């Protein structure tokens, strides 16, 4: 067990964690717990606090903060220790003490907007960071060399129990022809994984008189950075344009394949990727799993496979009246929580 440690910039305070990524079970977010070792010789600020800060960066508007009295042991605070922290203290000695956080549920997951290729600024998107600083009072200026920072991630893994197969069916009639055009799409399972093939079973019954010119399958990523404002934005992450055509009065059935993966999703900045520590490569933002059903402040992620039917135009209305038909199905793009 490699414990990511970090001494203070001037080698006076050392923060030791147990890990760097935290699993968001929706019902409970695992705790950010660690230990702090202080050197008395260089320790004279007379008090220290360790603060866990969840910030959305775009202008670094914070979304959450929580502080723990790192030293001296707060007389009012008395809570049981964790295995990691107690074992690390036993390893180090009596001049170190623990700090245990408890993230409140219903907070943004560790989602990072994809960094730009030709850019060097700090990554956007929410992120959690533990900052340890010696100070008599919180108002005291926190000198950079007398304070340390260490990033972490709260993230979600794919749902375990598979859900129902998302089958979307639709109909489209027209003034010229009363016969309905029936369309259907499905997906092999209810939850997909990053870089896994997606099967779109596009079936059609085009009894109409117009002509089908093309068919489009997409894996549009709906990312909603829902602040107090309720936004929702679109970004396609995979597309197949099948030239399969159903001329007037034709019945159709074909299965198409689409695997959203980051290989071709680099030039497009801002795509919701997972949480990054410094710059390591990461995958498309795992689908957010909102409880039940408040719109949690922060980023939320979803994916819909949008089957389409490029239908020809013409007739009494000519090309003025668009005859586009589509049908969308929500699925889940998360990571297979390993054993």
């Amino acid at each position: 067990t490699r414990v990511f440690k970090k001494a203070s910039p001037n080698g006076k305070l050392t923060v030791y964690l147990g890990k760097r990524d935290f699993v968001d079970h929706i019902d409970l977010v695992e705790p950010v717990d660690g230990v702090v070792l202080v050197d008395p010789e260089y320790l004279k600020e007379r008090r220290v606090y360790v603060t866990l800060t969840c910030a959305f960066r775009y202008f670094r508007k914070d979304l959450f903060v929580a502080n723990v009295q790192s030293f001296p042991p707060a007389p009012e605070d008395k809570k049981p220790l964790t295995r990691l922290q107690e074992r690390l203290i036993k390893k180090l000695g009596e001049h170190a003490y623990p700090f245990t956080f408890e993230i409140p549920p219903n907070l943004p997951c560790s989602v990072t907007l994809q960094p730009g290729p030709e850019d060097t600024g700090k990554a956007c998107g929410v992120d959690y960071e533990v900052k340890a600083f010696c100070a008599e009072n919180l108002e005291e200026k926190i000198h950079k060399r007398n304070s340390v920072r260490l990033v972490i991630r709260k993230v979600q893994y794919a749902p375990e129990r598979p859900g129902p197969q998302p089958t979307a069916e639709t109909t489209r009639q027209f003034l010229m022809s009363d016969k309905p055009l029936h369309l259907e799409a499905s997906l092999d399972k209810e939850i997909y994984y990053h870089g896994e093939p997606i099967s779109v079973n596009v079936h059609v019954t085009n009894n109409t008189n117009k002509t089908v010119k093309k068919i489009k399958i997409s894996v549009r990523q709906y990312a909603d950075i829902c602040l107090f404002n309720t936004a929702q934005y679109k970004c396609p992450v995979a597309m197949e344009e099948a030239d399969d055509t159903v001329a007037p009065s034709s019945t159709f059935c074909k299965v198409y394949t689409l695997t959203p993966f980051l290989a071709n999703n680099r030039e497009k900045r801002g795509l919701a990727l997972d949480g990054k520590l410094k710059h390591e490569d990461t995958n498309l933002a795992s689908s957010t799993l909102l409880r039940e059903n408040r719109e949690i402040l922060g980023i939320i992620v979803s994916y819909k496979v949008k089957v389409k039917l490029v239908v020809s135009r013409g007739g009494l209305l000519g090309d003025l009246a668009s005859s586009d038909v589509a049908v969308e199905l929500p699925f889940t793009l998360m990571h297979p929580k390993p054993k």
Partner: antibody
Amino acid sequence: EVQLVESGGGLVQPGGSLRLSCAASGFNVSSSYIHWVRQAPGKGLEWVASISSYYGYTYYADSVKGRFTISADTSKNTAYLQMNSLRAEDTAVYYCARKSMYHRGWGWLSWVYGAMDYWGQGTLVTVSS
Amino acid sequence: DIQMTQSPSSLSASVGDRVTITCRASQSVSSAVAWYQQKPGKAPKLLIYSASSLYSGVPSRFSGSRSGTDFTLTISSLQPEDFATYYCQQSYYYPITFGQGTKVEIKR
């Protein structure tokens, strides 16, 4: 279970080309590194190539830095090591191996390229006029 | 490019003999060395990884140890099946590189 099936090897004169196909089953080519390693007659191993499909990255050995064009298809879930201008030294019993990019922790340890756990049978490839 | 100074080129050992194969990475490796066993004709069966991790299903006799940049693979109780080449392989950097192989013949 994970299984790599290697195919596309046989006699080819010097200056010719083959195309090894490593069909991947039990795992997705996207979520792993696919390596090719050639062992010549009476010699040791010699790493040839490696690819990560999800991030679309490729690494090549010095001996094949341009003559081999590894790629992959996720639809068929297969890797394709082209082998152009196979020279005499290339005579070897090629093998397809891979590294599951799944970190024991969260999703992917994208910076390991670690030990190639699963090795395909590996087929003979000859170069002789 | 990097080179592994695997040695000895070839050693003869008997049943139960304690075999030791050194592998001196020419650079600073970070416990990302892997060891195989390529029986003739067959394919390299991965044994050790990260210079300290025994791959699943491999016999426990194989033991990889790191001494900075000197990775040593030890076979404490040699057994008949372990008469084949062995190639230490660093995975820390690119391109991956193997040792020189070290055949384990029989002694008489």
